[PDB]
Design a protein around this nucleic acid. Structure first.
Lengths: 194, 117, 128
RNA sequence: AGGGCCAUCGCUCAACGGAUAAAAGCUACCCCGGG
RNA sequence: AACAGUGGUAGGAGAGCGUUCUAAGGGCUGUGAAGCCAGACCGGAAGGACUGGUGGAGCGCUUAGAAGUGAGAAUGCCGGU
RNA sequence: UAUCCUUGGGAGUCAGACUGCGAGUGAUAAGAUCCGUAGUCGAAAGGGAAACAGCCCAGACCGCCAGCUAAGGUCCCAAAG
RNA sequence: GGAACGAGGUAGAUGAAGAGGUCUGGAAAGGCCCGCCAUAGGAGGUAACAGCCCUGUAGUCAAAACUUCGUUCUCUCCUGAGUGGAUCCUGAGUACGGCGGAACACGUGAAAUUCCGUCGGAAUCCGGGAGGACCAUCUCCCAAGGCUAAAUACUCCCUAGUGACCGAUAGUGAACCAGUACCGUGAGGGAAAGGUGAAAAGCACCCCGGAAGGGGAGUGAAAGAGAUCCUGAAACCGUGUGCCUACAAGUAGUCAGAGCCCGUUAACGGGUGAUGGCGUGCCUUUUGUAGAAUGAACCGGCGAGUUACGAUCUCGUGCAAGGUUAAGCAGAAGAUGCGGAGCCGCAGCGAAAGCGAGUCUGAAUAGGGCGCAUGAGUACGUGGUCGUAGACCCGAAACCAGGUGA
């Protein structure tokens, strides 16, 4: 909890009971599966022995139906059914995982704090030059507490980046990008939810 | 997702039909019949190898029993006399190799003859 | 944690026993089922009847008042807020299992006779 | 009112551990699973 | 490390290999990918590679995850002989 | 010498067969039937009985062109007087 | 009753930046080396994998004419509250009575309740009905007249879009002139069948032949790409050629083994094998098989323990005498917040009234039953079974309803 402060051209202390917890990596494995399963959609509906536009007459081995599953068109006795792939964790387990992924990147010298991230306009040239000053070559994260349209509209084209509000950080956001920029005003609001 | 899996049955059925190369007749093209013969081939190889160890010992007797019969001794009066007269753990297949000569093989019969009397 | 090396917890996962795929795994041909696969409760007579309105009050070991700050105005609407009782039903009955500590104002629908003296010994009031 | 809880009656249910309160043959050119 | 052990159906337990898709990185490919054809290589098995020929545009590795998951037998179905 | 009890999870099996002991039914007829004890087969290959599910001998983790024995054997087929 | 005003929909308009250089190639969208725009790196094309090649996207603006919504005028119509307390109404074959039925979770029972017929038959503010047969008590409420949006259910369709969906035996029966070709008098049943190339540049001419079909020549990166034509497997049919084979009894192999013939992911090699030893196919099913007990002509593809909701059990994880939220709302159909209604546990016994670390049983403070005393659950996840659903696939004869045929 002793990360330094950044300010475009140019050390603080965060809640050590939030950003300095020893991680629990078992709670970070099952938490990712619960957030990844929901992403999938599950809209594969196959046909059955009774939903085939086929005969019911015994034609003539025995073979009482033409569309029985051992024939040429019309099978899939069991097949994939359109269900729901989204279960729920207990609430403290959802709460513990976001603390663990944030505290892990404190140790690795990966989080970078900014002060309020003020832009001029929605230009990408000004945003691209700002990334060079902070040296974030691959993917990143920009967390802003008030959802400024400028920064959001100035960082929606660059491929590795992805803008989002501070009330909506979750597991697959922070675990995927390995560098992250926070406004110093947003560091308070993540402590208040958890 | 549907898994076709047509490409994995080509490679498994080829590896049998290479091991059946050289068999007579239709037993080296058809998978239904070559698979009945790679099974009885490996099962016959296990018995052949075991029977090969008890066979060659059956061969080495009938050469020792003739090479000793030049000197009046049979195989019984030889093996039994070579286990008391002196210490010569000469292997059946190892002694048969030295039985070709007159002189080295007869040197044991003479020693056994002295212990037999 | 990085997204490449997601090692699960040991014993937290298990592979599905897939039944009927080949003789080598076991459950090969007959699929783990094998070849060719008056009761007692209808001899025991029924037991009287049931009451249409049974009044069951919330009971708390006498030992539930040993973890509270000061015996004062211990009304059931504070028992239910802090959550020593999970749910107020008809009435709140106090049981005399356990040892009390100091005096604490108690407000209950009923009282056990052994429970009545133990609050009356520590210095508490039993207002029903 | 009605039921519970105790004392007590009604079973050859006799195919007695008691398929329902109640229940016969019949027909092959026979329908069909089996030697 | 020393001792003891290892036939096996129903059946119980454990450890593994493959196939398609998805996510993360890392990396082959028109100087030739998948597939197909050969071969006298490697692993205790299921199975992997490596050269050569055809082929003429895609594929694979590591850790995970989801299954329409692995065919020699149905007086199986469809095609071909 | 190292097993057997307790709770808990998962089962499979429920016309067995013949060979060595006294019966019963039968005609002390039956590779008949039904009993009870022991074995093997079931689920057990290898050696012997010319061939032989159950008799006699003995239990296969896999290699070796090593040795000693079991039942049974030693003129020839066929190893050994 | 009418016109305004604004938002949409039905056709569109506009739209940033590399021929960068060089290599290989039939061809650069690739390699190598260098730039650029970005509210635009979503897509699809292009001679092979484009952010700057087009067609486009973000964005901003557009419809004379039609409509679909709202905002506004115009238009249109329009009394409420007391106070009394003398008489009337306040919805009749109706409420209820009997018989016979039927429906409520309720099968006519202890049984209201609802609705039919069938027969009788009221009361009407001091009045009426209900509160599970019935009767007093008591609380709520006015029957026998009629209207009524929203929140909800499903879609042949219509735009916009997604897939841990399929990729030609799949997916709809149908990617192709498909309910077609055929079968049936009829009701009905019901297939097969995708791919040249970047373009036709789809073979002038010459030769053989009646033509087909060839052999050259040309196009092309490739003619082994020439019209059912990308790739082209196996069964099957053949032509060459190394080594065996005309005194030999064979589940066709295996082990021993010369002789000849070849040189390899160089290795105790490779291919044939005269001859000797041993050796009653495979799966199923049975007390048990070589069987004359059952199945398969062969090759290739397809083809059988699934998913919901419950129940219980082990392991892992979170918190722990306390854990956990559901619907729903705000949210890229997502995570996450928020929701304390409910559920399980924390102490039982008893038929119940009940009492309680005990309580039933009983004259019993006896004995005995159970229970603490000795106390760990709960929420999710994997996995193992059991349930209920077609429930592991395949396989009858019959039954009923609605129809087609002398």
């Amino acid at each position: 909890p002793k990360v330094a402060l950044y300010n475009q051209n140019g050390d603080i202390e965060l809640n050590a009971s939030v950003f300095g917890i020893e991680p629990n990596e078992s709670v970070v494995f099952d938490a990712i599966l619960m957030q990844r399963a929901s992403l999938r959609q599950g809209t594969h509906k196959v046909k059955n022995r009774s939903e085939v536009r086929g005969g019911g007459r015994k034609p003539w081995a025995r073979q009482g139906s033409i569309r029985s599953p051992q024939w040429r068109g019309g099978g899939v006795v069991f097949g994939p059914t359109p269900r729901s792939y989204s279960y729920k964790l207990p609430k403290k387990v959802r709460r513990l995982a976001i603390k663990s992924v944030l505290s892990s990147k404190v140790i690795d010298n990966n989080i970078i704090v900014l002060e309020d991230l003020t832009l001029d306009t929605a230009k990408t040239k000004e945003m691209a030059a700002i990334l060079k000053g902070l040296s974030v070559e691959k993917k990143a994260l920009i967390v802003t507490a008030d959802a400024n349209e400028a920064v959001a509209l100035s960082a929606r084209n660059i491929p590795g980046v992805t803008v989002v509000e501070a009330n909506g950080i979750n597991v697959l956001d922070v675990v995927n990008h390995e560098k992250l920029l926070i406004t110093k005003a947003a560091v308070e609001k993540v402590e208040e939810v958890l | 997702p549907r898994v076709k899996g047509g490409t994995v049955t080509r490679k498994r059925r080829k590896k049998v039909l290479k091991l059946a190369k050289g068999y007579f007749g239709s037993k080296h093209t058809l998978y239904k019949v070559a698979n009945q013969q790679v099974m009885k081939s490996g099962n016959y190889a296990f018995r052949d190898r075991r029977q090969k160890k008890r066979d060659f010992r059956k061969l080495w007797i009938t050469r020792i029993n003739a090479a000793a019969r030049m000197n009046g001794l049979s195989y019984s009066r030889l093996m039994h006399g070579l286990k008391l007269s002196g210490i010569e753990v000469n292997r059946k297949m190892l002694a048969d190799l030295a039985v070709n000569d007159l002189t080295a093989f007869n040197q044991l019969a003479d020693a056994a003859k002295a212990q037999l009397n | 944690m990085k997204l490449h090396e997601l090692k699960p917890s040991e014993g937290s996962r298990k592979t599905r026993n897939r039944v009927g795929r080949g003789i080598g795994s076991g459950n090969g041909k007959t699929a783990g089922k094998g070849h060719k696969g008056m009761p007692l409760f209808q001899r025991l007579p029924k037991r009287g009847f049931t009451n249409i309105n049974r009044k069951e009050y919330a009971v708390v070991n006498l030992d539930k008042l040993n973890g509270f700050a000061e015996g004062t105005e211990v009304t059931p609407e504070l028992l239910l807020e802090t959550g020593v009782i999970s749910k107020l039903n008809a009435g709140v009955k106090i049981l005399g299992n356990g040892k009390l500590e100091k005096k604490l104002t108690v407000k209950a629908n009923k009282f056990s006779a052994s429970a009545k003296e133990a609050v009356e010994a520590a210095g508490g009031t039993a207002e029903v």
